[PDB]
Design an enzyme around this catalytic site. Sequence first.
Site, mmCIF file in Angstrom:
data_model
loop_
_atom_site.group_PDB
_atom_site.id
_atom_site.type_symbol
_atom_site.label_atom_id
_atom_site.label_comp_id
_atom_site.label_asym_id
_atom_site.label_seq_id
_atom_site.Cartn_x
_atom_site.Cartn_y
_atom_site.Cartn_z
ATOM 1 N N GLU B 57 -12.191 5.807 5.253
ATOM 2 C CA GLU B 57 -12.768 4.747 4.430
ATOM 3 C C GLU B 57 -12.132 3.417 4.821
ATOM 4 O OE1 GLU B 57 -12.934 4.858 -0.233
ATOM 5 O OE2 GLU B 57 -11.872 3.021 0.318
ATOM 6 N N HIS B 58 -10.840 3.481 5.147
ATOM 7 C CA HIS B 58 -10.042 2.314 5.535
ATOM 8 C C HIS B 58 -10.205 1.751 6.947
ATOM 9 C CE1 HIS B 58 -8.140 1.172 1.969
ATOM 10 N NE2 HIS B 58 -6.978 1.793 2.068
ATOM 11 N N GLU B 134 -0.266 0.918 0.098
ATOM 12 C CA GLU B 134 -1.365 0.934 -0.854
ATOM 13 C C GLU B 134 -1.322 2.181 -1.706
ATOM 14 O OE1 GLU B 134 -4.994 2.253 0.975
ATOM 15 O OE2 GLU B 134 -6.060 0.522 0.117
#
Lengths: 406, 442, 49, 100, 54, 54, 54, 59
Positions: B57-58, B134
């Site tokens: 996703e990143h 994160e």
Amino acid sequence: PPHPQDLEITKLPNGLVIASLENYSPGSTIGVFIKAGSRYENSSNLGTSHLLRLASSLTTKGASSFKITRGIEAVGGKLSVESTRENMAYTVECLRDDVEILMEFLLNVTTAPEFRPWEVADLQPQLKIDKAVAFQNPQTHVIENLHAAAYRNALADSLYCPDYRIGKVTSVELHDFVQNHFTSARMALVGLGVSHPVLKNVAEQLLNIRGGLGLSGAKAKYRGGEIREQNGDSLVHAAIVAESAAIGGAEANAFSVLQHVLGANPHVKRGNPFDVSAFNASYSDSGLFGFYTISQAAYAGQVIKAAYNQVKTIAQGNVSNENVQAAKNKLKAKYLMSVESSEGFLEEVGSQALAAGSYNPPSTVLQQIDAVADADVIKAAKKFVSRQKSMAASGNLGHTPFVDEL
Amino acid sequence: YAQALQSVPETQVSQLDNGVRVASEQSSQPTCTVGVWIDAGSRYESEKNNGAGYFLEHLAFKGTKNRPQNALEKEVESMGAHLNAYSSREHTAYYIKALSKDVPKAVELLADIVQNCSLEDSQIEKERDVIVRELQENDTSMREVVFNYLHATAFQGTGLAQSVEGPSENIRKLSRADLTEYLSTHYTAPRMVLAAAGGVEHQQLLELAQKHFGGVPFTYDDDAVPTLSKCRFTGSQIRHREDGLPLAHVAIAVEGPGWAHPDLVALQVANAIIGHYDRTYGGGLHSSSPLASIAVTNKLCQSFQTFSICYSETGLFGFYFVCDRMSIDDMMFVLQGQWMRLCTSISESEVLRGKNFLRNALVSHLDGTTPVCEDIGRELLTYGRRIPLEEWEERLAEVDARMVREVCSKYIYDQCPAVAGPGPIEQLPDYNRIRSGMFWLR
Amino acid sequence: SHTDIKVPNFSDYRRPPDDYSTKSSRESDPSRKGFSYLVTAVTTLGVAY
Amino acid sequence: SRWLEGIRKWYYNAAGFNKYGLMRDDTIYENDDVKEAIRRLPENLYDDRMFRIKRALDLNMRQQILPKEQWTKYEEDVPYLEPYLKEVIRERKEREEWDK
Amino acid sequence: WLLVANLLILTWIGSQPVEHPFIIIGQMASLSYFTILLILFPTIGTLENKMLNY
Amino acid sequence: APNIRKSHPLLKMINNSLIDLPAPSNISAWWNFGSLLAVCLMTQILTGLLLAMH
Amino acid sequence: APNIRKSHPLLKMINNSLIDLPAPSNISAWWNFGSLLAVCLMTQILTGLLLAMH
Amino acid sequence: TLTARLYSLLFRRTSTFALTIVVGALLFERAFDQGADAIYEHINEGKLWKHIKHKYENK
Ligand code: HEM
Ligand code: HEM
Ligand SMILES: CCCCC[C@H]1C(=O)O[C@@H](C)[C@H](NC(=O)c2cccc(NC=O)c2O)C(=O)O[C@H](C)[C@@H]1OC(=O)CC(C)C
Ligand SMILES: CCCCC[C@H]1C(=O)O[C@@H](C)[C@H](NC(=O)c2cccc(NC=O)c2O)C(=O)O[C@H](C)[C@@H]1OC(=O)CC(C)C
């Protein structure tokens, strides 16, 4: 048959603009916008707005605090109140026939508030927290102070009741604050998922006050304030501004496009772990423009500086007529997009049905933003670099500079 | 009203000889939003494969080979479209929102990601340390950790138990490859859905997808979607104490049915009845939701929320609250008690409101374009097709008291729940106790 | 962190041979409880006597 | 023929709770309703009532009463709480009915 | 006091053999007793409240 | 208190000496002796009270 | 607590039912009845316990 | 399947459960006794009065 039914507007003999728009959604939502807010407070009565904003659920004359809350809930209702320094919007939402019933309570909450001396004297301790939660967001902190440092008199007044006054607001200051701002001329019974003939036949009961402009908030004198809040949060929040732009003020749209013309620049202008953006607030008789920069401590000095140079060299000709085309489009977007959600939308048919009494179609609202470009921007920026600047800041700061250090 | 529902534009859907299913809803709206919703997730990850879906996703945005970073973004920014997304345990998506005047442009973009991601080995080694940071942030969001831990013990041992984020050790060692090993493995048309809402004309969409999704399935495999390994629910607890924290969180739940199950309705109505509280509200007078009321009167919790988080074939029907080190107990008690009441002596007058309350979220669940696409994106993927508000309506416009009772009890009475609690919880009684809190001394 | 955390293996260690993943814990135990309860039901019984 | 008015006056002086010098309402047993009622009382009247009660107690505790002068006169008895108390009650009766 | 005495009575009537002079007196007081409690009191009760507008 | 098991003067005692009482997790049988001692006190008082009946 | 009259599990009870107990200022003899009732309970238990000795 | 049938029907509702303890106890009693009594008596054949009651009532 296609779902189109032109949004009728019919200004009552009072000054009570009634905007509807049957969009055929299952769930419709009525909303009473007002020109009230924390701009009309004096050195005293401060926060009476805020408190008021909470006294939403306090007994009226047509329905008890009980009835109202359970009343609205017995329908899958939703009553809530959004407010800004210069405007309070009392929305309510439901569906079908329940809109009719959902009304009785909204009607009473906004006109027949008999703010009982106990309920409030027992509700005030809420301010302590309602505020306490909102203040977990450092961002809100800096801003509250920004306006303080940006002004001096109405408007510069806080949005969240100051501490010292948490339990001193009087049940009176509430009526008195309403009797003076919740008046037909400065209200608007906006709404969606409704037939206008019905939304009108309600304004008939809503006719209980006239006084055009009861207390009118003083003009907003500008100030080059600067107020730092040393609190070591490992990461600084900073904002800088130069008074400017006003809603309806032709000089507005310019920044908007400069708001976008700016961003990819300040950001892509400041390398490292951070965040920075173009700040823009348009108020009735004033506004603001600048940039807030959430940045690590020690790298706070550098960050704002670079962010600034950019707003600087942006005025000294570093803006291709392309940057403008792109940015001119993003607003077209952000505008239209943030109108999908009937609440961010009913917010538009309202704002206007209040400040003007008209409704700029999506066509011309574009033709107006489309209207300017190269022509301003480069210059809108210049306005920033020259005029007087007012900064706000929260964080370790020991590494963050002051306006006198540009 | 009911007419309002009915006059609501049907949703168009048609799959490709490829596998993708292309659906969407049309309105007047200049704007719109469109996205590909993959049947991909963490659940689909392994012991050494856990994380990818995320680490992915990143990088799903930092570019493709056709158009590297600086350009994609520049092409996205420059047109004013918002390309956002997520990745859960059994659901991942990537939606964009433009002016509908970009269907064909947005669509292409979509395809160019779900299929060709730069995966720049140099871009990765950065996003690596980015996540690892994160993640360290996701961590003090007790509001969440409390849920993963819930999963962690609720579905201990199986695939769900693994958190969408994945262990630090994997994110510290995922290979340029493993990511691709993930992409090529799960990112396939049969499990992906192209959905959208706004001013778009289905056909134009189709053709564009049917145009940029030039996928070709040879084998019978490629055309078949694997069904997942069943996850064993395990009534248990997991306590991560720390009186050092402002307060403790508690989340307990019973096994959920799974999207399919028709009862998820009545059940959904259930959660409608006790709902949620949160000190900002304005109601010690609240609607039936005593949990709410009582939460006020006796200042029980900072906030509590009911949830029926469900998946393909399993679920997690429970409740989660946040409270001072000190009132944790009284809360559970009062709360857990409600479940009982709920499925032992619930009344019509109650369900009446419940319903309408759902019918309100039911509607507002679809508020705008992005959200609508979500359902469509979802609906198909997990349910098989699209559930119209006209349908959901009946589904839950026909749930009587006796039906709620019959349901909740069926999934709550004398069931072994899973509790999760981080923070100063010294006050939360052992299991047996919160366990014998499942049966009402009728 | 917290993602690094797991519920250890209680499988054979404890767990009745009706519980070792890949199959609903439900439908199964709603039988097990009967037993453990069965006992109690009985003890209560025996006690009465 | 016989005024309820004429009567009340009787009972009032008969109850003689004014000999201690406290209004009717200063007597009503304190039940859930009254408590809430009194808890709604303006601080003025509250402290007033308090003292009147403490004085009453202090007298009573001395077995002696208030000079014929200081007794409160029927017509001048101030139903300081009846109004609040009433709202209360109906507030309740409103709720009690709704919960059915 | 009508009660307290009605009690002191029952008592006397208790320390008294069973003959007309008594007996009746008996069952009588042994009636006022109940009534004074079960009925009189609560009646004279609400009544006095109304003699105060309550 | 919605509790009751804690809001009742009597009832609390119980839900405060038999329920909710914090006891060490690790405790050998040698800790039962006492609860037993009670049962004796009872068995003694009950039986003996009854034996005194004769 | 330097008090003791309040820091001792037993001792508190006393300095909490005989000392420090808040009682209304105005109280007639009709309030002694009870403390007396106790003294009876005692006088009875003491004497009778002693009478049972024979 | 007994145990499952049992739980659902008998042990689930605290209302029911109890009810079977009762009706069960009645059964356990009646049966436990007869069994016990028999076990006992048998372990003492011809020694009990029930067993000699007959030399003035035969056997
Ligand atoms: C504290 C526990 C008690 C102890 C330690 C205790 C012990 C005894 C003992 C050892 C005897 C002699 C029994 C024998 O002959 O073997 C006895 C007798 C008796 N106890 Fe207790 N007793 C206790 C409580 C009671 C109570 C509460 C009562 C009644 C108030 C009671 C009434 C009697 C009677 C009736 C006898 C006489 C008949 C007999 O000898 O068995 N006992 N008790
Ligand atoms: C609760 C208070 C008590 C009451 C109401 C009470 C009352 C009586 C009464 C009225 C009698 C008959 C006395 C008579 O012949 O005039 C009596 C007798 C007796 N009581 Fe009590 N009694 C009480 C407590 C006790 C206690 C605590 C004991 C010892 C446990 C006790 C042991 C006796 C004895 C030895 C007799 C028999 C000798 C006698 O008749 O005087 N009494 N009690
Ligand atoms: C109405 C009934 C009220 C309950 C009274 C009853 C109450 O204290 O019940 C328990 C807690 C008490 N023992 C314990 O708490 C206990 C404490 C630590 C460990 C264990 N177990 C070991 O593994 C315990 O069992 C046990 O020793 O009985 C006492 C002492 C009392 O009862 C006695 O006064 C009765 C005498 C006075 C007749
Ligand atoms: C070790 C000794 C501990 C002291 C126990 C002892 C203790 O409650 O002593 C007083 C407070 C109690 N009466 C009062 O408090 C009291 C209360 C309001 C007014 C007055 N006066 C009126 O003007 C009082 O007198 C009185 O009624 O005795 C009881 C009841 C108890 O004692 C009884 O259990 C003994 C029985 C069980 C044998």
